[PDB]
Amino acid sequence: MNLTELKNTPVSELITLGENMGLENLARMRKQDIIFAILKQHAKSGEDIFGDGVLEILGFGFLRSADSSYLAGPDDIYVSPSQIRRFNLRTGDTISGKIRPPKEGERYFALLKVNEVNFDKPENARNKILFENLTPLHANSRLRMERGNGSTEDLTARVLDLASPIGRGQRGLIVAPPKAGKTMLLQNIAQSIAYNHPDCVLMVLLIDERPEEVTEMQRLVKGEVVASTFDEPASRHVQVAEMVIEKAKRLVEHKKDVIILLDSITRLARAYNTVVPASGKVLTGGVDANALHRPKRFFGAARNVEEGGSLTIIATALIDTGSKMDEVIYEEFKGTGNMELHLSRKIAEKRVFPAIDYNRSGTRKEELLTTQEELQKMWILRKIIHPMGEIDAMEFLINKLAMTKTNDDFFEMMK
Amino acid sequence: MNLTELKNTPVSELITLGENMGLENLARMRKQDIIFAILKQHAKSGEDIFGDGVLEILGFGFLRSADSSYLAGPDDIYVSPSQIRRFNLRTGDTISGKIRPPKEGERYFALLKVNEVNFDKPENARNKILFENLTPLHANSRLRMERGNGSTEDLTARVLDLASPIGRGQRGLIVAPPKAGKTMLLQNIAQSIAYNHPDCVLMVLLIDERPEEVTEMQRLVKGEVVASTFDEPASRHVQVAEMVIEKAKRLVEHKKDVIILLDSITRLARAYNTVVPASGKVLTGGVDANALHRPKRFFGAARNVEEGGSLTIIATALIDTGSKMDEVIYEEFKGTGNMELHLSRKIAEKRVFPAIDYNRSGTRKEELLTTQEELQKMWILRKIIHPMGEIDAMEFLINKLAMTKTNDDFFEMMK
Amino acid sequence: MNLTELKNTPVSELITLGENMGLENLARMRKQDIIFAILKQHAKSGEDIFGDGVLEILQDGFGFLRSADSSYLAGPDDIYVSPSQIRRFNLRTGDTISGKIRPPKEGERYFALLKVNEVNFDKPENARNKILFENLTPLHANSRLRMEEDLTARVLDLASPIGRGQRGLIVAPPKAGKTMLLQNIAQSIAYNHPDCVLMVLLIDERPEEVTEMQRLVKGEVVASTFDEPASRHVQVAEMVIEKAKRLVEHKKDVIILLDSITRLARAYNTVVPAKVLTGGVDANALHRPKRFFGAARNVEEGGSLTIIATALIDTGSKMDEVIYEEFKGTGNMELHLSRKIAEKR
Amino acid sequence: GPEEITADIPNVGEAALSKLDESGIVYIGAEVTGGDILVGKVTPKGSDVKDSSLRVPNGVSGTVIDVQVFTRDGVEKDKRA
Amino acid sequence: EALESALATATKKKYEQEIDVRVQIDRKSGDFDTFRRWLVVDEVTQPTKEITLEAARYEDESLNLGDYVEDQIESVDRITTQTAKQVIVQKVREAERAMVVDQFREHEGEIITGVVKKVNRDNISLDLGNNAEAVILRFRPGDRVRGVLYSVRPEARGAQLFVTRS
Amino acid sequence: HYIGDLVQRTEVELLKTPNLGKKSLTEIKDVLASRGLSLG
């Protein structure tokens, strides 16, 4: 008896099971009302009910579900503050334990006993080192995006590795104007990470995005996809973004490699700028004095932990969107991170993918992820690409990468 | 004796029928009073009275009419909350059944039994999957706006198909300055949809528009034209927009292809910004924080359903109106849609209709609405049109499309 | 028993030490609450408690002793300084006070100061009688602070020799080597002149570079990342210059390694009450960082204050150019870097 | 300050207010007895209003059969009036 | 806090055999709710406001002794404003008293004189005609007392300037 | 069903059962404040 197990079941099985029990007509009823009726009838027998979800502390807290993208629902598990005072739980701690249906006078499921905390025993979670106590360092472990199988999808990952290598805990920005191919590039990164490094928790977070890319992402990648379309206000965009970063931070504290692919750093800045109270001080572009304080907090959270685990955040930026506010947001975020992946619109319109600005790209302290001979080969490649034009460099790169299958054979033939 | 059939008859026939029955002088009485009088006399003999209408739940609700834009009236079909809790009826459900004249102390016709729900069997209407549980789909089916009869009216549709192909479930935006030709362009789209795709449920929602434009649209296109002139307050604009979106969702749940042509997305945004209570926080341009929440969901409701039916909403944006509030609304909703049909004022001043900005126009993911060879021919056409100016592009396009009737002949001559 | 000593101990030792004393379970508790619980239980035994920190006088009259390891942040374990003690010892902002402290009673949230034992790492008798910084005669740089990873320091010495009380501006475009150049300066100062108080004041910087700058040089690195508001950036900048001025009055050689020419100027421009100049800068917004930069001077009676700043030009915004053009006329040393040479590595 | 005839009187019970309506007048036909409340009225001492309601004298009882309300010109009428 | 304490006192005086009623409201639009609380204790003293530990068993006995806030909210007049106004004007005098404390600290550093009001055992009082008051840890009312204050402890219902001589 | 069965047991024994709710416990405490029932 699990909450997520009954929730993933279709409506046909839920209605059929209810009709055999002899209850009210479940056809003209909501899915949550059907499960609520089944859990009540099953609890009257004497059996126990189990549930799970990430805690969202308001004094009381709620265990939001993963299928609802952590949204306030009627079937949320009520977590009294007394339970938060005993185990000292925080926002982001996944609580998987025995639950009970709301009795007379109650409206939410109550937590009777917790069995699993953050996909681990509660005994190991009561004694843990906080994320603020972890000593951060630069990217040490290399996350090679190149799969090595030889498919034409791997071409984007190969160019990315030769331009800006990404490791565990790396924080980069993919600068790209609208209509540049950020969706196909992000899906290629998600597939390359899950295939090469299946141990890294992949989380594709979408904020203020379109519902077309939401169902397209869930049905393409193999992992957890939390999305919040623009149908929700900016307050929900803030809450969903906070629930993901809090869940990610708690997993990193358990020595886990969490990777967040949020293509909404520009929209999240607008989301905080809308929900922030007016202070009477507006900067250039319509940004409040503290509207950028929050997105910089989420952005800077990405770091590499030496004691264990890592938090990787690869976000895409938007430029030349016709609004001066996005330019100020981009300018403040240009000098914030240590990896800028600029994409040229002129090359993108010519159907030349990947349209990556190889000259403007780069990685700070890249010697910690690549060897000495590999760094030299990248330097020789830059000395040949830089004199050629932007379009000429892409045509030169495609013609050279088409001669072989892997980048190792390419570097061996150039020497 | 239906209510809608009796309301469509002229007043001359109603007064004539009232005098033959032997009632009081109906010349100085209201048409609604004549209807209320003849129903009591007709039910006095023993015959039953039947009616219909869309439900508008206030706990109780009424069955409003479509010819009066769902205006609140004292003579409608009262729907008691007992029947609402019995059949689980919601706002937008078309209810048809037997009615009775009100007794002493009542002011509305009571509903006894519902016979037809949403113009379908009640058994198929009670067991259904809600719109919130429908799995979205991409734009697969092509809604070819081209007539093919070689008429000069088809030139607007031919340019639209080459610039922004529209399919089932598409959510586009028609950006145009005032006095550009949005009226004639919308009428041509309404005529092309009703002629090429008669199965689609065409809807025209002209909120806060001129009365002469309202009566002209009803007498020009072949379909339902629900409008709300500027003589009505913003509360009417909210209620009419709510009745339209609720009726549209019920049809999509009934596997119907609804196409809503909206020309008041900016006016509707002002309507919600006017009726929203004072929250205390005002953004740039005099827009409330919760003022853009309602129109963004109405415009975003358009989606393609895999289980059956689709919802297409093509709104028209207004720019360069001299007010900074409309610019903020336009710039906020620009990141929501996936199609921008820009109209150039410089071309409209030269009396070159239609004045469509072919350069800034386009549709993302258009490869799923056109074939491989069709997408390539559109790419070749753009690569030649892009270097030329906006005015020179239209003169080149008009002279080429005028040589033949269909775009297939033009594609064969370019090769 | 010192406050800073307990804040540097690991969490594992604090949990074990607390459980032996017979208190509530410290495993599921914050580090600040553990130290606060230990100090209360240790004070009930009868032992004395000592603390230290840089004084920050509030507007209401009282002040708090900000800790150095917390980057001068208002914490629950701050040492309350009554206004009576400020008027008694003539205390001002920046006076590092170390004395016997006591845990707050029922209803208080800050440690109270009973008796001061040391003022600014010196006897209180030498601090009560002192010459103000405004009375010290300003002079040019006399003593040579030779900076001779060493290749950058050699070029800097041959281009513009930096000495005690120097006021320079390291002008460089984005992606020109400011990170590598600043590390070589910080390493050279801590190695050649370990007696000087090296304070790497970073404002609106990356956290990973902040913890790498702190864990590499041998000195005190008070930094404030972008995670903090502009109001704290202004306060931390004031705490540094006030502490530096007091040390110069105490005959100390302080070297303020400032890297916030643009970040701190935007911070003052953000918190200044609303005169519109070119770039969106108020007329009274650049006066505060001007005295902050101009405070660097050589004192003949004793001590010196050196401030080596790094300018940011060609950042794509005209506001940074006006700030650079205004601060250029104040200093007397500009070290420009070429982007063409930096791109060629 | 003037006095009001509001239906809410300080220091009363539920049974005492049962016979009173939403305005403060006993329903015509109620079985009133001695000691009950007829009309509620408080006078402001300096809110600091004091109880000055009209009650039924001891011993006498009866049934309310008519209630007359006369108000001065200009003053607004109440729901009972 | 003064408003919710006034409503708590008003509800306390309303009931006869029900004491220790509290109410918490910290929102502008959010109305106030009266939730009567009981004292968590393992004894049976004060049976009108005491509760057993078995009520805290739902919380896995997490509620330690000394903190007593948990109960179901119950149903929540213009006459209550009489005692409410008295509490408001009382806290204003306490807030004005704290203002004199701040003004005294700004001009502190001189020996002051005070007049005793009452002779409470181990706690006398002082009088200064500036809406101020001070106490000295262990005279007759009408005599001037010389004492220098050094610290002020947060006494209940408003802090008081503690003066010491030794 | 009768008040005698509930008054025979103390309030502590009644609170150790999941059948009792928050509103029922508050109502029992209010009736016990008058020293009429639920006195152990």
Q: Which CATH superfamily is domain B1-124 in?
A: Nucleic acid-binding proteins (2.40.50.140)
Q: How far apart are the C-alpha atoms of B203 and B92, rounded to whole Å?
A: 15
State which residue of chain C sits closest to E151, comparing Cα positions: C82
Max CA separation in chain F (angstroms): 25
Test mutation, A26, A230, A265, A349, chain B, max B CBs within 10 A: A230
Q: How would you class A295 by CB atoms within 10 Å of its CB: exposed for 0-12, middle for 13-18, buried for 19 or more?
A: buried
Max CA separation in chain A (angstroms): 78
User: Is there a cis peptide before residue A354, judged by omega within 30 degrees of 0?
Assistant: yes
User: Is there a cis peptide before residue B277, judged by omega within 30 degrees of 0?
Assistant: no
Q: Touching check for C207 and chain A: CB below 8 Å?
A: yes
Q: How far apart are the C-alpha atoms of C95 and C79, rounded to whole Å?
A: 13
Tokens in use for E54?
């078995």
Q: How far apart are the C-alpha atoms of C246 and A372, rounded to whole Å?
A: 49
Question: Among partner residues E106, E108, E153, which is closest to C105 by beta-carbon distance?
Answer: E153
CA angle (C157 as vertex; C151, C160 as ends), nearest 5: 130
CA neighbours within 13 Å on the CB side: how many for E25?
A: 17
Are A136 and C315 an interchain contact pair (Cβ–Cβ within 8 Å)?
A: no
Secondary-structure class of domain C129-345 per CATH: alpha beta
Q: How far apart are the C-alpha atoms of B261 and B266, rounded to whole Å?
A: 14
**Of C133, C121, C97, which is closest to residue C303 (Cα–Cα)?**
C133
Can you say whether residue C307 is alpha, beta or left, with left for phi > 0 and alpha for psi between -120 and 50 degrees?
Answer: beta
Q: How far apart are the C-alpha atoms of A21 and A45, rounded to whole Å?
A: 13
Task: Find out whether A300 is annotated in a ligand binding site.
Answer: no
Q: Touching check for C28 and chain A: CB below 8 Å?
A: yes
> Which residue bears the tokens 């003539």?
C90
| Range list for CATH 3.30.1480.10 in chain E | 1-102
Q: How far apart are the C-alpha atoms of A250 and A253, rounded to whole Å?
A: 5
Q: How far apart are the C-alpha atoms of A39 and B40, rounded to whole Å?
A: 52
Q: Touching check for E62 and chain A: CB below 8 Å?
A: yes
Q: Residue E86 contacts by C-beta under 8 Å, 6 or more apart in sequence?
A: E6
DSSP A236: H
| Range list for CATH 3.40.50.300 in chain C | 129-345
Statement: C1-126 belongs to CATH 2.40.50.140: yes
Q: How far apart are the C-alpha atoms of A311 and C267, rounded to whole Å?
A: 29
Residues of C whose CB is below 8 A from E153: 105, 107-108
Query: What letter represents residue C136's amino acid?
Result: L
DSSP A167: B
Give the sheet arrangement for strand E160-164, strand by strand.
E112-115, E144-153, E160-164, E132-137, E123-128
Residue E91: in which H helix or E strand, if any?
helix E81-106
| Range list for CATH 2.40.50.140 in chain E | 103-163
Q: How far apart are the C-alpha atoms of C304 and C133, rounded to whole Å?
A: 11
Q: Touching check for E129 and chain C: CB below 8 Å?
A: no
Number of Cβ within a 10 Å radius of residue B127: 12
Q: How far apart are the C-alpha atoms of B144 and B397, rounded to whole Å?
A: 19
CA angle (B158 as vertex; B157, B164 as ends), nearest 5: 80
Max CA separation in chain E (angstroms): 60
Bridge partners of C307, per DSSP, are C167, C256
**Of A45, A35, A50, A63, which is closest to residue A2 (Cα–Cα)?**
A50
E strand spans, A101-217 = 109-117, 136-137, 171-175, 201-209
Q: How far apart are the C-alpha atoms of C341 and D15, rounded to whole Å?
A: 95
Q: Residue A408 contacts by C-beta under 8 Å, 6 or more apart in sequence?
A: none
C-F interface (Cβ pairs under 8 Å ≥ 3): no
D-B interface (Cβ pairs under 8 Å ≥ 3): no
Task: Find out whether B400 is annotated in a ligand binding site.
Answer: no
Q: How far apart are the C-alpha atoms of C25 and B102, rounded to whole Å?
A: 73
Q: How far apart are the C-alpha atoms of E133 and E153, rounded to whole Å?
A: 14
Are E105 and C107 an interchain contact pair (Cβ–Cβ within 8 Å)?
A: no
Subunits adjacent to chain E (3 or more Cβ pairs under 8 Å): A, C, D, F
Q: How would you class B179 by CB atoms within 10 Å of its CB: exposed for 0-12, middle for 13-18, buried for 19 or more?
A: exposed
CA angle (B205 as vertex; B203, B207 as ends), nearest 5: 175
Task: Find out whether B167 is annotated in a ligand binding site.
Answer: yes
Q: Touching check for A383 and chain C: CB below 8 Å?
A: no
Residue D33: in which H helix or E strand, if any?
none
E strand spans, chain D = 37-39, 42-44, 49-51, 54-55
Q: How far apart are the C-alpha atoms of A4 and A109, rounded to whole Å?
A: 14
* DSSP string of C193-233, one letter each residue: -TTSEEEEEEES--HHHHHHHHTTSSSB--EE-TTS-HHHH
Structural contact between residues B394 and B356, judged by C-beta atoms closer than 8 angstroms: yes
Query: What letter represents residue B359's amino acid?
Result: N
CA angle (B186 as vertex; B182, B189 as ends), nearest 5: 145
Q: How far apart are the C-alpha atoms of A378 and A388, rounded to whole Å?
A: 16
Tokens in use for D73?
């010109």
3 state DSSP class of E149: strand
3 state DSSP class of C34: helix
CATH topology of domain B127-415: Rossmann fold (3.40.50)
Number of Cβ within a 10 Å radius of residue B339: 21
Query: What letter represents residue C290's amino acid?
Result: K
Structural contact between residues A230 and B336, judged by C-beta atoms closer than 8 angstroms: yes
Burial D48-78 (b: 16+ CB within 10 A, else e): ebeeebeebeeeeeeeeeeeeeeeeeeeeee
| Range list for CATH 2.40.50.140 in chain C | 1-126
Bridge partners of E153, per DSSP, are E160
Test mutation, A86, A103, A104, A113, chain E, max E CBs within 10 A: A86
E strand spans, A179-246 = 201-209, 224-229
**Of C242, C263, C248, C277, which is closest to residue C311 (Cα–Cα)?**
C263
DSSP D76: P
Burial B210-246 (b: 16+ CB within 10 A, else e): eeeebeebbeebebebbbbbeeeebebbbbbbbbbbb
Question: Mapped to the 3 state alphabet, what secondary structure does chain B carry?
Answer: CCHHHHHHCCHHHHHHHHHHHCCCCCCCCCHHHHHHHHHHHHHHCCCCEEEEEEEEECCCEEEECCCCCCCCCCCCEEECHHHHHHHCCCCCCEEEEEEECCCCCCCCEEEEEEEEECCECHHHHHCCCCHHHCCEECCCCECCCCCCCCCCCHHHHHHHHHHCCCECCCEEEEEECCCCCHHHHHHHHHHHHHHHCCCCEEEEEEECCCHHHHHHHHCCCCCEEEEECCCCCHHHHHHHHHHHHHHHHHHHHCCCEEEEEECCHHHHHHHHHHHCCCCCCECCCCCECCCCHHHHHHHHCCCEECCCCEEEEEEEEECCCCCHHHHHHHHHHHCCCCEECCECHHHHHCCCCCCECCCCCCECCHHHCCCHHHHHHHHHHHHHHCCCCHHHHHHHHHHHHCCCCCHHHHHHHHC
| Range list for CATH 2.40.50.140 in chain B | 1-124
| Range list for CATH 3.40.50.300 in chain B | 127-415
Tokens in use for A344?
């040229």
Number of Cβ within a 10 Å radius of residue C344: 9
Q: How far apart are the C-alpha atoms of C330 and C292, rounded to whole Å?
A: 11
Test mutation, A82, A84, A103, chain E, max E CBs within 10 A: A82
Provide CATH code, domain E103-163: 2.40.50.140
Q: How far apart are the C-alpha atoms of C329 and B27, rounded to whole Å?
A: 92
A vs C: CB pairs below 8 A: 56
**Of C247, C252, C210, which is closest to residue C227 (Cα–Cα)?**
C210
Inter-axis angle of helices A265-275 and A324-334, nearest 10: 110
Structural contact between residues B184 and B352, judged by C-beta atoms closer than 8 angstroms: no
CA angle (B223 as vertex; B218, B225 as ends), nearest 5: 45
Max CA separation in chain C (angstroms): 67
Q: How far apart are the C-alpha atoms of B254 and B311, rounded to whole Å?
A: 12
> Which residue bears the tokens 């309310």?
D64
Structural contact between residues E8 and E22, judged by C-beta atoms closer than 8 angstroms: yes
Tokens in use for B305?
């359903």
Q: How far apart are the C-alpha atoms of C307 and C237, rounded to whole Å?
A: 13
CATH tag for E1-102 (out of 3.60.20.30, 2.40.110.10, 3.30.1480.10, 3.60.21.10): 3.30.1480.10
Q: Touching check for C302 and chain A: CB below 8 Å?
A: no
- Ramachandran angles phi, psi of A14, nearest 5°: -70, -40
Q: How far apart are the C-alpha atoms of A255 and A245, rounded to whole Å?
A: 15
Residue A200: in which H helix or E strand, if any?
none
